[PDB]
């Protein structure tokens, strides 16, 4: 039996693995490190690059770069490195032996999709490939063909309304506020409490506190007042160095930014409004379906309390008689990848792959032809 | 290009009720004598074909999800539905049916009442353990 690979390339993390598995086997930072101090005659017996954790460890001698910006591939040369590392270092497979499914952001430019096709066939020699929209795969993973997906990762947030299996392009919303911006904010508000964190090195410690102690308040004002009274919201966190710190109203102030971007000096509307707004851009006759099938997807949607706040936030925005429902599956950090693993495993998917034969005949333009 | 499958070749060719069960990533027909008997651990795809006076055929696709069905099954029933609709030139109306919360229409396909049974076919998704 031939085994398909699934690769979900994110702005912050690469999710990679094998079709048929219930989770990505390789999860690592989408980072490429290159020597800070270079030259034709500088570091002869040394690697010209590193990827993921290796790059972060050797951060002191490297220049770190993220080839995917806000869900879009922006540095082709660095992306090939990511892919190479994925195949050879993490999956330990010979690319030329496995049909490969990749993911893309909604509204991904035509030429980007072609570039991805070309590299896979021309540089990696895959026998077959296929590109799928991230948000739609999340919907499939929740066993729905209609709903609106809130996909929030490390670099981008999108609202993607889908009907009967297809996104509605006209109604998609993108917001350049996500996980990384929240990590940066928690860094800035901890300084107010005294704690010193500015460098790229410290950013990685604050991110762990963001993922362990933060949460979303049901009512931000009351929460603030309740934190000024007793200290029942206060929590302790042990530093790598052994020191202990006490975290307070920042636990809920940090993800509050998702609802009030003004906190980071952004003038956009919050994620509740962009959701309501995307829904209102759809045909009135489908809104009920959308409203009742709000799927949350991605890392930045993992904060405890997120589903209750959004439930509260959107009933306020919508017609008084609208039945509203937020679906926040425990596996939502991997929903996209899981959707792909199921899709690539289906009996009916065999004919869907783009063959090397088809590519040689038609060229990169073939990717669009579905 | 379109999606081909032996079962897709059989779908909506004439008025009636067709029921397929999701079995290890494939669309498998349910024996006609067993219609209405749903395994609570499985997911199904039902196609209802009605004859219109105008000579055209009306289509209603319903994917039914048992309370104990695995992610690969519920995910695949939803995809197969999309694919069956496309094969039918998108002429079908898609309905999501959850155990104990089925719609009045769907419940009406079964004259002697729909019945729930414990069990079902195994998942084909390989469990992935977090590092020890
Ligand atoms: N348990 C958690 N609580 C809060 N935030 C989390 C949690 N786990 C992960 N995150 C944040 O989510 C991000 C990783 O999420 P994800 O893998 O869905 O996105 P991505 O693929 O990297 O980025 P994008 O899809 O925006 O291009 C990081 O910002 C991470 O800090
Ligand atoms: Ca992603
Ligand atoms: Ca089952």
Coordinates of C-alpha atoms and ligand atoms in Angstrom, one line a residue:
Chain A
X1 CA 0.0 0.0 0.0
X2 CA 1.1 3.6 -1.1
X3 CA 1.2 6.1 1.8
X4 CA 0.2 9.7 1.5
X5 CA 1.7 12.5 3.5
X6 CA -0.2 15.6 4.8
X7 CA 1.6 18.9 5.3
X8 CA -0.1 21.9 7.0
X9 CA 2.2 24.8 6.7
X10 CA 1.4 27.6 9.2
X11 CA 2.8 31.0 9.9
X12 CA 4.1 29.7 13.2
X13 CA 4.1 25.9 13.1
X14 CA 4.4 23.2 10.5
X15 CA 2.0 20.3 11.0
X16 CA 3.2 17.2 9.1
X17 CA 2.4 13.5 9.1
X18 CA 0.8 10.6 7.3
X19 CA -2.7 10.3 5.9
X20 CA -4.7 7.9 8.2
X21 CA -3.1 9.1 11.4
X22 CA -5.4 11.1 13.8
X23 CA -2.7 13.7 14.5
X24 CA 0.4 15.3 12.9
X25 CA 3.5 13.3 13.7
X26 CA 5.8 16.3 13.3
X27 CA 4.9 19.7 14.8
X28 CA 7.7 22.3 14.8
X29 CA 8.3 26.0 14.3
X30 CA 8.2 27.3 10.8
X31 CA 11.6 28.9 11.0
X32 CA 14.7 29.0 8.9
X33 CA 18.0 30.0 10.5
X34 CA 21.0 31.2 8.5
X35 CA 24.4 32.3 9.6
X36 CA 24.4 35.9 11.0
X37 CA 28.1 36.2 10.0
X38 CA 28.5 34.9 6.4
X39 CA 31.0 34.9 3.6
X40 CA 32.5 32.8 0.9
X41 CA 35.4 32.2 3.4
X42 CA 33.3 32.2 6.7
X43 CA 32.3 28.8 8.3
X44 CA 33.6 26.3 5.8
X45 CA 32.7 23.0 7.6
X46 CA 29.3 24.4 8.8
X47 CA 25.6 23.9 7.7
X48 CA 24.3 26.8 5.5
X49 CA 20.9 26.7 7.4
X50 CA 18.9 25.2 10.2
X51 CA 15.1 24.6 10.6
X52 CA 12.7 24.5 13.6
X53 CA 14.0 23.8 17.1
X54 CA 17.6 23.3 15.8
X55 CA 17.4 26.9 14.5
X56 CA 15.9 28.3 17.8
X57 CA 18.6 26.5 19.9
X58 CA 21.4 28.0 17.8
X59 CA 19.5 31.4 17.7
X60 CA 22.6 33.0 19.2
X61 CA 24.6 32.5 16.0
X62 CA 21.7 32.7 13.5
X63 CA 19.3 35.1 11.8
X64 CA 15.8 33.6 12.1
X65 CA 13.2 34.1 9.4
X66 CA 9.6 33.0 8.9
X67 CA 8.9 32.1 5.3
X68 CA 5.1 32.3 5.8
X69 CA 3.6 35.7 6.6
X70 CA 0.0 35.9 7.8
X71 CA -0.6 32.4 6.3
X72 CA 0.9 33.2 3.0
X73 CA 4.2 31.9 1.6
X74 CA 6.5 34.9 1.2
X75 CA 10.1 33.5 0.9
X76 CA 10.3 30.7 -1.7
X77 CA 13.9 29.8 -1.0
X78 CA 13.3 29.4 2.7
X79 CA 10.1 27.4 2.1
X80 CA 12.0 24.7 0.2
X81 CA 14.2 24.4 3.3
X82 CA 11.1 23.8 5.5
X83 CA 9.8 21.2 3.1
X84 CA 13.2 19.5 2.8
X85 CA 13.5 19.3 6.6
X86 CA 9.9 18.1 6.8
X87 CA 10.5 15.2 4.4
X88 CA 14.1 14.2 5.4
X89 CA 14.5 15.3 9.0
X90 CA 11.1 14.9 10.5
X91 CA 9.1 12.3 8.5
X92 CA 12.2 10.4 7.3
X93 CA 10.6 9.6 3.9
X94 CA 11.7 9.8 0.3
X95 CA 9.4 12.4 -1.2
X96 CA 9.5 10.7 -4.6
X97 CA 7.7 7.7 -3.0
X98 CA 4.6 9.5 -1.5
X99 CA 1.7 11.5 -3.0
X100 CA 1.6 14.8 -1.0
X101 CA -1.3 16.9 0.2
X102 CA -0.5 20.5 1.2
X103 CA -2.8 23.2 2.6
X104 CA -3.3 26.8 1.7
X105 CA -4.8 29.9 3.2
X106 CA -8.2 31.0 1.9
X107 CA -7.8 33.7 -0.8
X108 CA -4.3 32.3 -1.5
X109 CA -3.1 34.0 -4.8
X110 CA -3.3 31.9 -7.9
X111 CA 0.5 32.2 -8.6
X112 CA 1.4 31.1 -5.1
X113 CA -0.6 27.8 -5.7
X114 CA 1.3 27.3 -9.0
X115 CA 4.7 27.9 -7.4
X116 CA 3.9 25.3 -4.7
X117 CA 2.9 22.8 -7.5
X118 CA 6.1 23.5 -9.5
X119 CA 8.4 23.1 -6.4
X120 CA 6.8 19.8 -5.4
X121 CA 7.0 18.3 -8.9
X122 CA 10.2 19.9 -10.1
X123 CA 12.3 20.1 -6.9
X124 CA 10.9 17.2 -4.8
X125 CA 9.8 14.8 -7.6
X126 CA 6.6 13.8 -5.8
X127 CA 4.5 11.2 -7.7
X128 CA 1.4 13.3 -7.0
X129 CA 0.1 16.3 -5.0
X130 CA -2.9 18.3 -4.1
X131 CA -3.6 21.7 -2.4
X132 CA -6.6 22.2 -0.1
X133 CA -8.1 25.2 1.8
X134 CA -7.2 25.1 5.5
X135 CA -10.6 26.4 6.8
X136 CA -12.7 24.0 4.7
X137 CA -10.7 21.0 6.0
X138 CA -11.5 22.1 9.6
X139 CA -15.2 22.1 8.8
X140 CA -14.9 18.6 7.3
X141 CA -13.0 17.5 10.4
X142 CA -16.0 18.6 12.6
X143 CA -18.4 16.5 10.4
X144 CA -20.1 19.5 8.8
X145 CA -20.5 20.6 5.1
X146 CA -22.0 24.0 6.2
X147 CA -20.9 26.4 8.9
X148 CA -18.6 29.4 9.4
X149 CA -15.1 28.7 10.6
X150 CA -13.1 31.0 12.9
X151 CA -9.5 30.0 12.1
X152 CA -6.9 31.8 14.3
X153 CA -3.3 30.8 14.4
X154 CA 0.0 32.5 15.1
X155 CA -0.1 34.9 12.2
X156 CA -3.7 35.3 10.8
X157 CA -7.3 35.1 11.7
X158 CA -9.9 34.4 9.1
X159 CA -13.7 34.1 9.1
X160 CA -14.7 31.6 6.4
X161 CA -18.4 30.9 5.7
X162 CA -18.9 27.6 3.9
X163 CA -22.1 26.3 2.2
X164 CA -22.6 22.8 1.1
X165 CA -18.8 22.1 1.0
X166 CA -17.5 25.3 -0.5
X167 CA -16.2 28.6 0.9
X168 CA -18.0 31.7 -0.3
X169 CA -15.1 33.8 -1.4
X170 CA -16.8 37.2 -1.4
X171 CA -17.7 36.8 2.3
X172 CA -14.3 35.7 3.7
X173 CA -12.6 38.0 6.2
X174 CA -8.9 38.2 7.1
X175 CA -7.5 39.9 10.2
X176 CA -3.8 40.3 10.8
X177 CA -4.1 39.9 14.5
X178 CA -3.3 36.5 16.1
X179 CA -1.1 34.4 18.5
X180 CA 2.2 36.2 17.9
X181 CA 0.5 39.6 18.5
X182 CA -0.9 38.3 21.8
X183 CA 2.5 37.0 22.9
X184 CA 4.0 40.4 22.1
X185 CA 1.2 42.1 24.1
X186 CA 1.6 39.8 27.2
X187 CA 5.4 40.8 27.0
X188 CA 4.5 44.5 27.1
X189 CA 1.9 44.2 30.0
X190 CA 4.3 42.1 32.2
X191 CA 6.8 45.0 32.0
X192 CA 4.1 47.1 33.7
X193 CA 4.3 44.5 36.6
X194 CA 8.1 45.0 36.5
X195 CA 9.3 41.9 34.6
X196 CA 11.9 42.5 31.9
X197 CA 11.3 40.7 28.5
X198 CA 12.1 42.3 25.0
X199 CA 14.4 40.1 22.9
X200 CA 13.4 37.2 20.5
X201 CA 14.9 34.8 23.1
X202 CA 12.5 36.0 25.9
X203 CA 9.4 36.1 23.6
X204 CA 9.6 32.2 23.7
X205 CA 9.1 32.1 27.5
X206 CA 6.1 34.5 27.5
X207 CA 4.4 32.4 24.7
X208 CA 4.5 29.4 27.2
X209 CA 2.8 31.5 29.8
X210 CA 0.3 32.7 27.3
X211 CA -0.6 29.0 26.5
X212 CA -0.7 27.8 30.2
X213 CA -2.3 30.5 32.3
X214 CA -4.3 32.8 30.0
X215 CA -8.1 32.7 29.4
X216 CA -11.0 34.7 28.0
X217 CA -13.3 36.7 30.4
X218 CA -17.1 36.4 29.9
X219 CA -17.4 40.1 31.0
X220 CA -14.2 42.0 30.8
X221 CA -15.3 44.9 33.0
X222 CA -16.5 42.7 35.9
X223 CA -13.4 40.6 35.5
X224 CA -11.2 43.6 35.9
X225 CA -13.1 44.7 39.0
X226 CA -13.0 41.2 40.5
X227 CA -9.2 41.2 40.0
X228 CA -8.9 44.5 41.8
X229 CA -10.8 43.1 44.9
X230 CA -9.5 39.7 46.1
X231 CA -6.7 37.7 44.4
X232 CA -8.7 34.6 43.4
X233 CA -7.7 35.1 39.7
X234 CA -4.0 35.2 40.6
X235 CA -1.8 32.3 39.5
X236 CA 1.8 31.1 39.9
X237 CA 4.4 30.2 37.2
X238 CA 7.8 28.5 37.7
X239 CA 10.5 30.0 35.4
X240 CA 13.1 27.9 33.6
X241 CA 15.6 29.3 36.0
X242 CA 13.6 28.2 39.1
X243 CA 12.2 31.6 40.1
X244 CA 8.4 31.9 40.6
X245 CA 6.2 34.7 39.3
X246 CA 2.6 35.7 40.1
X247 CA 0.3 36.5 37.1
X248 CA -2.9 38.5 37.5
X249 CA -5.4 40.5 35.3
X250 CA -3.0 39.9 32.4
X251 CA -4.3 36.3 32.2
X252 CA -7.5 37.7 30.6
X253 CA -6.2 41.0 29.4
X254 CA -4.0 39.4 26.8
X255 CA -6.7 37.5 24.8
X256 CA -9.1 40.4 25.3
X257 CA -7.2 42.0 22.4
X258 CA -8.9 39.5 20.1
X259 CA -12.2 41.4 20.9
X260 CA -10.7 44.8 21.3
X261 CA -7.8 45.2 18.9
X262 CA -7.5 48.9 20.2
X263 CA -5.4 47.4 23.0
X264 CA -2.5 46.9 20.5
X265 CA -3.2 50.1 18.6
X266 CA -5.1 48.3 15.8
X267 CA -8.1 50.1 14.4
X268 CA -9.9 46.9 13.1
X269 CA -13.1 45.5 14.6
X270 CA -12.8 42.4 17.0
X271 CA -13.3 38.8 16.0
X272 CA -17.0 38.8 17.1
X273 CA -17.8 41.7 14.7
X274 CA -15.7 40.3 11.8
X275 CA -17.7 37.0 12.3
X276 CA -21.1 38.8 12.4
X277 CA -19.9 40.9 9.3
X278 CA -18.8 37.8 7.3
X279 CA -22.2 36.2 8.0
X280 CA -24.1 39.4 6.9
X281 CA -22.2 39.3 3.6
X282 CA -24.0 35.9 2.9
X283 CA -27.4 35.2 1.4
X284 CA -30.0 35.8 4.1
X285 CA -31.4 32.3 3.4
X286 CA -28.3 30.6 4.7
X287 CA -27.5 32.8 7.7
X288 CA -29.4 30.5 10.2
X289 CA -27.1 27.6 9.1
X290 CA -24.0 29.7 9.6
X291 CA -25.1 31.2 12.9
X292 CA -25.9 27.7 14.3
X293 CA -22.5 26.2 13.1
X294 CA -19.7 28.4 14.3
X295 CA -16.6 26.2 14.2
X296 CA -13.5 27.3 16.0
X297 CA -10.2 26.2 14.5
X298 CA -6.5 26.8 15.4
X299 CA -4.1 27.4 18.3
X300 CA -5.3 31.0 19.2
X301 CA -8.8 29.6 19.7
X302 CA -7.7 27.3 22.6
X303 CA -8.1 29.9 25.4
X304 CA -10.5 28.7 28.1
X305 CA -13.7 30.8 28.0
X306 CA -13.3 31.7 24.3
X307 CA -16.4 29.8 23.2
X308 CA -18.7 31.3 25.9
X309 CA -17.5 34.9 25.1
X310 CA -18.1 34.5 21.4
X311 CA -21.5 32.9 22.1
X312 CA -22.3 36.0 24.3
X313 CA -20.7 38.4 21.8
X314 CA -22.6 37.2 18.7
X315 CA -26.0 36.8 20.2
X316 CA -25.7 40.5 20.9
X317 CA -24.9 41.3 17.3
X318 CA -27.5 39.0 15.7
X319 CA -31.3 39.1 15.4
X320 CA -33.0 38.4 18.7
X321 CA -34.5 35.1 17.4
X322 CA -31.4 33.6 16.0
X323 CA -30.3 30.2 17.4
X324 CA -26.5 30.5 17.9
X325 CA -23.9 27.8 18.5
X326 CA -20.1 27.7 19.0
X327 CA -18.3 24.5 18.4
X328 CA -14.8 24.3 19.9
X329 CA -13.5 20.8 19.5
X330 CA -10.8 19.7 21.9
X331 CA -8.6 18.8 18.8
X332 CA -9.0 22.1 17.1
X333 CA -5.2 22.9 17.1
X334 CA -5.0 20.2 14.5
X335 CA -8.4 20.3 12.9
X336 CA -6.9 21.4 9.6
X337 CA -4.3 18.6 9.4
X338 CA -6.9 16.1 10.6
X339 CA -9.3 17.2 7.9
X340 CA -6.5 16.5 5.3
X341 CA -5.6 13.2 6.7
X342 CA -9.2 12.0 6.3
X343 CA -9.7 13.6 2.8
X344 CA -6.4 11.9 1.5
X345 CA -7.5 8.6 3.0
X346 CA -10.9 8.4 1.2
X347 CA -11.6 5.8 -1.5
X348 CA -12.9 8.6 -3.8
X349 CA -9.7 10.6 -3.4
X350 CA -7.6 8.5 -5.7
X351 CA -8.6 10.2 -8.9
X352 CA -8.3 13.6 -7.2
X353 CA -4.5 13.7 -7.0
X354 CA -2.6 15.7 -9.7
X355 CA -0.2 13.2 -11.3
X356 CA 3.4 14.0 -12.4
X357 CA 2.0 12.8 -15.8
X358 CA -0.7 15.5 -15.8
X359 CA 1.9 18.2 -14.6
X360 CA 4.3 17.3 -17.4
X361 CA 1.5 17.6 -20.0
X362 CA -0.2 20.8 -18.7
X363 CA 2.3 22.6 -16.4
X364 CA 1.7 24.4 -13.1
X365 CA -1.6 25.8 -14.4
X366 CA -3.1 22.3 -13.8
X367 CA -3.5 23.1 -10.1
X368 CA -6.5 25.4 -10.9
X369 CA -8.4 22.9 -13.2
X370 CA -10.7 21.3 -10.5
Chain B
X1 CA -12.8 16.5 -14.0
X2 CA -15.5 14.9 -11.7
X3 CA -15.6 12.2 -8.9
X4 CA -16.2 8.6 -10.0
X5 CA -17.2 5.6 -7.8
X6 CA -19.2 2.4 -8.4
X7 CA -21.8 3.6 -5.9
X8 CA -22.0 7.0 -7.4
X9 CA -22.9 5.3 -10.7
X10 CA -25.9 3.8 -8.9
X11 CA -27.1 7.0 -7.0
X12 CA -30.3 8.9 -7.9
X13 CA -31.0 6.9 -11.1
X14 CA -34.7 6.4 -10.0
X15 CA -37.2 7.4 -7.3
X16 CA -36.5 5.7 -4.0
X17 CA -34.3 5.6 -0.9
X18 CA -30.6 4.7 -1.0
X19 CA -28.5 4.2 2.1
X20 CA -24.7 3.8 2.4
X21 CA -22.6 3.4 5.5
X22 CA -19.1 4.8 6.0
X23 CA -16.8 1.8 6.3
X24 CA -13.1 2.2 6.7
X25 CA -12.8 5.3 4.5
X26 CA -15.2 4.0 1.8
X27 CA -18.9 4.3 0.9
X28 CA -20.5 0.9 1.4
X29 CA -24.2 0.1 0.5
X30 CA -26.5 -1.0 3.3
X31 CA -28.6 -4.1 2.6
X32 CA -32.1 -3.0 1.7
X33 CA -33.7 -5.2 4.3
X34 CA -31.7 -3.4 7.1
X35 CA -32.9 0.1 6.2
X36 CA -33.8 2.1 9.3
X37 CA -31.4 0.2 11.5
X38 CA -28.7 2.7 12.4
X39 CA -25.5 1.8 14.4
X40 CA -24.9 4.5 17.0
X41 CA -21.2 4.1 16.5
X42 CA -21.3 4.7 12.8
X43 CA -22.1 7.4 10.2
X44 CA -24.3 7.1 7.2
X45 CA -25.2 8.8 3.9
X46 CA -28.8 8.6 2.7
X47 CA -30.0 9.7 -0.7
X48 CA -33.7 10.3 -1.2
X49 CA -34.9 10.6 -4.9
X50 CA -38.4 11.9 -5.6
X51 CA -40.1 12.1 -8.9
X52 CA -41.2 15.6 -10.0
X53 CA -44.2 16.2 -12.3
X54 CA -41.9 18.2 -14.6
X55 CA -40.0 14.9 -15.3
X56 CA -37.0 16.0 -13.3
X57 CA -35.7 14.2 -10.2
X58 CA -35.5 15.9 -6.8
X59 CA -32.6 15.0 -4.5
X60 CA -32.1 15.2 -0.7
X61 CA -28.8 14.1 0.9
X62 CA -28.7 13.4 4.5
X63 CA -25.6 12.4 6.5
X64 CA -26.5 10.8 9.8
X65 CA -24.0 10.8 12.7
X66 CA -24.2 8.3 15.5
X67 CA -23.4 9.4 19.0
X68 CA -20.4 7.1 19.3
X69 CA -19.0 7.4 15.7
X70 CA -15.3 8.3 15.2
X71 CA -14.0 11.4 13.6
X72 CA -12.9 9.7 10.4
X73 CA -16.4 8.4 9.9
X74 CA -18.3 11.7 10.6
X75 CA -15.7 13.6 8.5
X76 CA -15.9 11.1 5.6
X77 CA -19.8 11.1 5.6
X78 CA -19.7 14.9 5.2
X79 CA -17.1 14.8 2.3
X80 CA -18.9 12.0 0.5
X81 CA -22.1 14.1 0.7
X82 CA -20.3 17.0 -1.0
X83 CA -18.9 14.6 -3.6
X84 CA -22.4 13.0 -4.2
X85 CA -24.0 16.5 -4.6
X86 CA -21.3 17.5 -7.2
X87 CA -21.8 14.3 -9.1
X88 CA -25.5 15.2 -9.2
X89 CA -24.5 18.6 -10.7
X90 CA -25.0 20.1 -7.2
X91 CA -28.8 19.5 -7.6
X92 CA -29.1 17.9 -4.1
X93 CA -30.0 19.7 -0.8
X94 CA -27.7 18.6 2.0
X95 CA -28.9 17.9 5.6
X96 CA -26.9 17.1 8.7
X97 CA -28.7 14.6 10.9
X98 CA -27.6 14.0 14.5
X99 CA -28.9 11.0 16.5
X100 CA -31.9 11.9 18.6
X101 CA -32.2 15.3 16.8
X102 CA -33.1 14.2 13.3
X103 CA -35.5 16.4 11.2
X104 CA -39.1 15.6 10.6
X105 CA -38.4 15.1 6.8
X106 CA -35.8 12.4 7.4
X107 CA -37.8 10.7 10.1
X108 CA -40.6 10.5 7.5
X109 CA -38.5 8.3 5.2
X110 CA -39.0 5.5 7.6
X111 CA -42.6 4.4 7.8
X112 CA -42.1 1.9 10.6
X113 CA -39.8 4.2 12.6
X114 CA -36.1 4.4 12.5
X115 CA -34.2 2.2 15.1
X116 CA -30.9 2.6 17.0
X117 CA -28.5 -0.2 17.6
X118 CA -25.4 -0.3 19.8
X119 CA -22.1 -0.9 17.9
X120 CA -20.8 -0.5 14.4
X121 CA -17.6 -0.8 12.3
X122 CA -14.2 0.1 13.6
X123 CA -12.3 3.4 12.8
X124 CA -9.3 3.3 10.5
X125 CA -7.6 6.4 12.1
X126 CA -4.3 5.6 13.7
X127 CA -4.2 6.9 17.3
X128 CA -1.2 9.3 17.9
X129 CA 0.3 9.5 21.4
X130 CA 1.8 12.6 22.8
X131 CA 5.5 12.4 23.9
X132 CA 6.1 10.7 27.3
Ligands
LIG1 N1 -3.1 26.0 24.4 C1 -3.0 27.3 23.8 N2 -3.6 28.5 24.3 C2 -3.4 29.7 23.7 N3 -2.8 29.9 22.5 C3 -2.2 28.7 22.0 C4 -2.2 27.4 22.6 N4 -1.6 26.4 21.8 C5 -1.1 27.2 20.8 N5 -1.4 28.5 20.9 C6 -1.0 29.6 20.0 O1 -1.4 29.3 18.7 C7 -0.3 29.3 17.7 C8 0.0 28.0 16.9 O2 -1.3 27.8 16.3 P1 -1.5 27.3 14.9 O3 -0.6 26.1 14.7 O4 -3.1 26.9 14.6 O5 -1.2 28.4 13.8 P2 -0.2 28.5 12.6 O6 -0.4 27.4 11.6 O7 1.1 28.5 13.0 O8 -0.5 30.0 12.1 P3 -1.5 30.5 11.0 O9 -2.5 29.3 10.7 O10 -2.0 31.8 11.6 O11 -0.8 30.8 9.6 C9 0.8 30.0 18.5 O12 0.6 31.4 18.5 C10 0.5 29.4 19.9 O13 1.1 30.2 20.8
LIG2 CA1 -2.7 27.0 10.0
LIG3 CA1 -17.5 3.2 14.0

